[PDB]
Amino acid sequence: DRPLRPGDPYPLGSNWIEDDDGVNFSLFSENAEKVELLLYSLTNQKYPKEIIEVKNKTGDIWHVFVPGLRPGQLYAYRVYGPYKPELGLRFNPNKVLIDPYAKAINGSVIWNDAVFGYKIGDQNQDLTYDERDSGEYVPKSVVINPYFEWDDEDFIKGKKVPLKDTVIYEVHVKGFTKLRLDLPENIRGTYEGLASEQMISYLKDLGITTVELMPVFHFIDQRFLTDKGLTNYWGYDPINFFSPECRYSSTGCLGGQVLSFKKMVNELHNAGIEVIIDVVYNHTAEGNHLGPTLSFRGIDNTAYYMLQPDNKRYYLDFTGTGNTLNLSHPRVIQMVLDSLRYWVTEMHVDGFRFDLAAALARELYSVNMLNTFFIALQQDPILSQVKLIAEPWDVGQGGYQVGNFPYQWAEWNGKYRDSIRRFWRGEALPYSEIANRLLGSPDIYLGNNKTPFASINYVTSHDGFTLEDLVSYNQKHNEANGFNNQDGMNENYSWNCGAEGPTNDQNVVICREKQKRNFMITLLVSQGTPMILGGDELSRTQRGNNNAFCQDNEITWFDWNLDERKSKFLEFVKKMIQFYRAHPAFRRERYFDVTFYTLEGREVDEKTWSSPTQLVIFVLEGSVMDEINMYGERIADDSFLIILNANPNNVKVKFPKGKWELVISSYLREIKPEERIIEGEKELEIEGRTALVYRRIEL
Amino acid sequence: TRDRPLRPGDPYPLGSNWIEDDDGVNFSLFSENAEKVELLLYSLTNQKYPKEIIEVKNKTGDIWHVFVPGLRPGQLYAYRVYGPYKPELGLRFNPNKVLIDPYAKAINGSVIWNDAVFGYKIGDQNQDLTYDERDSGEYVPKSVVINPYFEWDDEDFIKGKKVPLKDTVIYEVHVKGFTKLRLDLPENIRGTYEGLASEQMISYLKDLGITTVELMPVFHFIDQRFLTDKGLTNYWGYDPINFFSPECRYSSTGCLGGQVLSFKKMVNELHNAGIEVIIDVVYNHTAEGNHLGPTLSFRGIDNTAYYMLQPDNKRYYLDFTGTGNTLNLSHPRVIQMVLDSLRYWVTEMHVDGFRFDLAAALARELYSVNMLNTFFIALQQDPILSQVKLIAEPWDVGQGGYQVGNFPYQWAEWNGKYRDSIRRFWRGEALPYSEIANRLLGSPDINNKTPFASINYVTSHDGFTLEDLVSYNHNEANGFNNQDGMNENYSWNCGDQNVVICREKQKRNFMITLLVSQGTPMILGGDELSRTQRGNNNAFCQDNEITWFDWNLDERKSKFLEFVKKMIQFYRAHPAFRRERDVTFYTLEGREVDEKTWSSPTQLVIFVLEGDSFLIILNANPNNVKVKFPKGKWELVISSYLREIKPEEGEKELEIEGRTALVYRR
Fold first, then answer.
1. Domain spans of chain A?
2. B1-147 has which CATH code?
3. Most buried by CB count within 10 Å: which residue of A133, A313, A460, B364?
4. What is the CA angle B332-B337-B340, rounded to 5?
5. Spatial distance between the Cα atoms of B611 and A31, rounded to a whole number of angstroms
6. Which one from A237, A300, A350, A391 is the annotated catalytic residue?
């Protein structure tokens, strides 16, 4: 007998209107017989306060306005339909579902046989129909207040840092500040903790421009992970594409995660720092048949999911996770684009990084959506300005297969990390190959973007070894993950430097520290936008675990100990990053000028260019670049000489023309007077496994 | 170089953009192939000569941009683009030619024609390969930096319920014609946005009972040289040169930003009234025509991009419409422009829907480059564009069918043939009985294929109106031997007053049938005022007495308006004609339908709604036939009539007359 009204279809989800004093509720469902809105009082989460049958429907969209409800109000849905699993029809109104357009989720799921929708349990498995209510264990979607006081006016509008000037920083929200002891407990390893005053000055002192946060979409710890006493630490199982992860909130989970995130981002922008978020669109946490009925599968399984034709009880898997969104259906492709748009206009994120992007492109291609998906990004008013990061993929015949890539499109260059790892390991590599990597990989980027900065260079990431573990480790040690070490990449191209794991041997440590420095300069001397693994500066180690996706503990937390070894390296990284930012010679837009050299100090003819090498010498020649980014003012950078000696043996190099001055090197030892400045082609005795950078000073 | 001081600015939003903090204007322009770009600043008095030449020196990707401090709304600019001139490669960049900004939100006047606006020596052996030298400044209208802000009070009608397609009655109306000869209104708002929006209109139209107004073209369009030389002016707007500017011609308040202002207010009134605005867009060609075309904008900015060139002879331009060019919809910026323009007119100009002219050709052009379906996905997923009404025509493209996954959620189509069908049953000729039974049903044999998706229109902006063929049963003024427009609209001659008896019965008829049909109906503007074109069915260059709405009541109109008002009133009163379907039916006489009968080429239709219940009888026809009502009580409400109502016309026998149509209730 309530003054309820039909309300509006737009926008999707729950919408608090100031004026009409109440909240518009809307949910997409094509195959539902009946929809029910459930409102929960903070005090009781087991049974709804009030149940409202949603009776008005515009096209495939159910909606009702409900007066008097306000920001902070908990809710959920029960969706009604046929249950013929063999037809992919899995409607179970006993299961209390998460709104797909929820902007916040009030906690985690509590693993119990009743969140499944089939009997466990039974031997028909997914054919059966479980009657138990799920509400007791399913967090509720939350109505939020979208309003926020942004004074990142300077930043947002309009001209932020481009990829040519970007240093990215891949960092887990929790691990970053979990053991930053000069922060109060409740904000340690949280969004607010991350953007705190000292954290900001730290990231500023390091010199990184762009933060890449690991998954912040609200994810779910897998059953098989919690049965073993482990959580999903990396967050690669979204259940909702609009809500900040409740776990990383310092200010609670009834809007607090939205507010803290919005806060954190605003601080970061004011400091001059960009936010990229790692995003998963290739699968949902619901898994395959057999997985839980938490949201999509309950709302409309047939839409939403890619089903096996001829056996619709099964889900198509391109990723090995269990499901694929039905990206051909206009609502599903809408949700993705709606997600991307939300996070930019409302959460003020500067761009995205697509996890398993080769898979994501395969899925899109699967239903003829890849090129249209790209056109959607390019013409969209807000989406065509953000940064979009992915990976190479040849599908399936398959060269990219794509009319045109967004202006700020870039790809993780795994070939760059492999080549670089192998080089410093001692593997003599074709000169042309190692050199191309340093030149930003024009052999990969013929007509993908016409810029070196489409290539995201890196030596380490969240995947596999931490730069510390890379130089200390020959094979993975992932028994802690509980997969009897079968999980995680096996090709690592690593080297322990003479001892596996921690050692007392100062010969081994000298190798290691020297080597870390080698990679750090190789990376910040190459064309392409570089990405650094958070922790690498702190000499962070997961002690041989190369796939710590499930270690929310001591192993993964950043260790803020001021050990002198560690400290001295943090000093090196700072100095090198600074050097990179300080010189647009290593940051060219059009390379797709240099001169490469031999041991005996001459130019490089074919054969020399084609035979494996262990030593790279080259000069960034010239200066006049166009510009800078301001009205008609060309600058000129100093000319540099880079010597990289991976050959494990001392070697004698003939320098090229002019005066050269050593600006930085991997020598841990003090620098001899005849090494600071060198002229007139006279030879220097270069140590084995050493990297060196010189600027010319005349003429 | 120059001064000035100049902030590089931002690449987005495309166009001129004044920022009221840095107290300047931001300029951004696309040109993938440009060598050099020069912004030209102009004083509102000197236009032959540019006040300032500014070298646009920064580009982000394929967007040139510069920020100029000090400039504000009202500023007149144009661009100059340098690059190769190898017209055999399709490359035809010409600095001497002053170009409009494709993203300009306002333009100052029409093109003053001259040999200089072309990029080749207008007269020569190799027309369209030759390099013309002449400056184009004076002739080419200037792009105007605009005043974006505007105060909307229709917040109440913006959201939410805008009159749904079910409840809709649409009214197709040309802007000038609507109130040019509407004398009781000042001598400067007549034939303007604000004129159409006078408080004497609106009260008129709300009084008339239509809930949606569909304007003929308002995209700033030019004149065909190439016609005016015949002393005619493009009066239909179906030849645009920019996609963001309201047409200069229909502004009561000048052409330096008053087109923007007059249009917005227009809408804001219409909305407060409680009515809906749909505008008539053209995206299938620009006003530049083929090679041998004026170099106004896109040809000059970037010919490669923008235009679909003939492979093997990029000299020439692929034409799908017979107008000379097609936009290169496969280039991301070109497709972006179209989608930006659709988004602009909605969020910014508060427009409720579009009607794509020559939709099939547009679908085909889109198809030609694999963009049709991706165009449709873009529209559905767009937060603003998916909410608006969208109106085209049917088409059969590529390899059969529509070649589209899904349509937008308020898609509808000009039923090209429902008018060829209703104008043939009433016409008298041999006509099938499941055919016209279909037309009235919603035409469900073809989209969402739920009746609302059909635009049941008896009359388009196409001809006639209403009768005016039936007169025909006048393409001489249009200076080309009378072969232009449709070939037969299927009408009587009705040939006095005793040799014109059917005229008023060849009105009211279409009316009573059209409003009774399931779906959504379209009247031509001023068929209730009994409009006329003195015979013309193709009045596209008639800015004359021919087209302008004759508002002085000749006496036999005015009775008819009071009919249409009451006729449409009925459909605006009962949910019995607003569904996705309980229909009846009844042949002569009294007899519930069978299969003879179902395919019999004659002139008799009856039906009922159970299903407020209603009985409806409709017939053609050359002579009288026996009439018997069916099961249930019958009470008259409205009709067509040779005289008036007498007398008193369960179950019995009437019996009905000739050229005529009729109705009842329960």
1. 1-145, 146-590, 591-699
2. 2.60.40.10
3. A460
4. 115
5. 27
6. A391
